[PDB]
Structure 1
């Protein structure tokens, strides 16, 4: 069933900085996740060009943003490439060890925290708003996995069967108490218009 792993010391530190550095432009987290979703979708398009069969698991290439005010979660879903157990475990397929280092080198020399994603580690910006992140994923070459973390130094991976998802990645953000603004329809619309306005894939904003 559940496996628990430690974050590489460096990522544990990056996460820590995000959680513990005072920085109020928290909204950028949405841009960064949306920007991973876009890339993930880029990858599935790229392979499909040579191999139509890769989109047997779904033809549509899009992003859903799903607020749920009851559970207090913001879910970002794509039908992009997904991650294998191994990518999941390895820093969710980022070059996070090298990218973290640079980011901090770059932080000492005039970079703010919103530059995070220029270092390939935008994912962790989730922790600006989220107390706990669950990432469900399905890659064509593997089964469905759930990854989970509330920082603290550890993450867990387990396989996942409650609802198959064909192909893609579902980043579930359980918001901190004081961050429920990110569940308001007008706040999400404003953010998407302001930071992810022009992007290669449709974004549906679910209503409640």
Structure 2
């Protein structure tokens, strides 16, 4: 008795290409010698704050949207053994469609405009002004994993090593309830951001007036 599941039904792991504009920016960011790489943390905390604003805005008319979790917070978890730095927020999260669209497609206009601005003398720290600060994670990360849960969909995982493609798959792991977890697999030369002394310095310098609690976990 040796059965075989010739066809699993849905495709578990789906691979897609970035819009060319996004892929070219990711290549720029992952290989640049820009000396102020710490700004990645500002951009990711700002994205987390925006996501928390969103859920809060939504709950004003429908308090039940907080049934998946009442606390609105940001957590930063450096992990020296796995060389990961994780930023967790309990914000709005992303459905599967929005996950593919928001990280793989809709950033096209922002990444295009940002690269034109860079060509004309702008600098990388302005990335957030084009709505695409998420990709600054590749200043310090060789790989990024995003775990996300939106009230209207199941938990999903996104990942990319900036090779022009990304993958999406249902995540049946530890439920996060609601929100997004951005997991940075750090480059060898950027492990300074695994140290509590360094991470605090960056938060105090760049994110000292964010309207949500930021907790650091060692």
User: When the two structures are superposed, what TM-score results if normalisation uses the length of structure 2?
Assistant: 0.93
Kindly indicate whether the alpha-carbon contact (under 8 Å) linking 2:22 and 2:112 is maintained by their aligned counterparts in 1: no
Aligned residue pair count: 207
CA distance in 2, matches of 1:67, 1:120: 25
Q: How far 1:110 sits from its partner (Å)?
A: 2.0
Distance 2:57 2:102 in 1: 23
Instruction: Report the counterpart of residue 50 of structure 1 in structure 2.
Output: 61
8 Å contact kept, 2:75–2:216: yes
Give the C-alpha shift of residue 109 in structure 1: 2.1
- Aligned counterpart, 2:122: 111
Q: What's the offset of the Cα at 1:19?
A: 1.4
Is the 8 Å Cα contact of residues 95 and 120 (structure 1) preserved in structure 2?
A: no
Larger Rg, first or second structure (1 or 2): 2
Provide the C-alpha distance between the structure 2 equivalents of 1:93 and 1:65, rounded to a whole number of angstroms.
24
CA contact (8 A) 2:19 2:104 kept: no
Which of residues 102, 114, 120 is equivalent to 2:113? 102
What SS does the aligned partner of 1:90 have? helix
| 1:120 and 2:131 correspond | yes
Q: Which residues of 2 match residues 192-203 of structure 1 at below 5 A?
A: 192-203=203-214
Consecutive unaligned residues of structure 1, counting only runs of 5 or more, are none
CA–CA separation in structure 2 for the residues paired with 1:198 and 1:95: 29
Cα contact 2:22–2:104 (8 A) shared by 1 = no
For residues 129 and 27 of structure 2, the distance between their equivalents in structure 1, rounded to whole angstroms, comes to 19
Match of 2:187 in 1: 176
Mapped contact 1:32–1:122 kept (Cα < 8 A)? yes
Q: Find the aligned partners of 1:157 and 1:94 in 2 and give their Cα distance.
A: 14
Paired with 1:95 and 1:122, the residues of 2 have a C-alpha distance of: 13
CA shift, 1:24, in A, is 1.3
How big is the shift at 1:94? 7.8
Query: Contact between 1:83 and 1:93, CA under 8 Å: does it hold in 2?
Result: no
Deviation (angstroms), 1:127: 0.4
Moved more, 17-26 or 188-197: 17-26
CA offset digits 1:35-72 (Å, max 9, x no partner): 00000000000010111000000000000001111111
CA RMSD across the alignment:
1.1
More deviation in 16-25 or 58-67? 16-25
